[PDB]
């Protein structure tokens, strides 16, 4: 009987399978444009808006 | 490595042939070899000329 | 797959980072699938017509 398996090597191909993933729906729908760029270096770490009368 | 048969006419039927068996040799990584030096900025300014030498 | 730290200042000095751990999926060979036939030269001459059907 032949024994060949030291002739060859155990190969890990360079490819990845797919992972799982998740949906981002809250981010898209909350308010975006109102707080954009408002907290910056002149502001310190918070800022405020006005409640109605 | 192989072995041979000697017959008058070359008729090899019935007898044993050479199996094929593979061996292999392995080699491994060692430790690092490292030299490390340190010196002050003061010394580079006023002391170490020819640091490459 | 990774995971994340939550710091007030971004100071991660004393903590546990992610570890890289690799898995792999493997696949093999099965048996052969073989279909084999035979027939006599005489049968071919006087009998097997439409051999390709």
From TrEMBL, chain A:
It comes from the Viruses. This is Gene 5 protein. It comes from Shigella phage Sf6. The chain holds residues 2 to 54 of 423 of the full protein.
């Amino acid at each position: 009987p032949n024994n060949l398996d030291s002739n060859v090597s155990q190969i890990v191909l360079k490819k990845f399978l797919p992972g799982f993933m998740s949906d981002l729906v809250l981010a898209k729908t909350v308010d975006r444009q109102l707080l954009a760029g408002e907290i910056n270096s002149s502001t310190g770490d918070s800022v405020s808006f006005k409640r109605p009368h | 490595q192989f072995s041979s048969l000697r017959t008058p006419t070359g008729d090899i039927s019935g007898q044993n042939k050479n199996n094929l068996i593979s061996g292999k040799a392995t080699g491994r990584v060692g430790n690092y070899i490292t030299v490390a030096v340190e010196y002050q900025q003061l010394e580079e300014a006023i002391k170490l000329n020819q640091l490459e030498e």
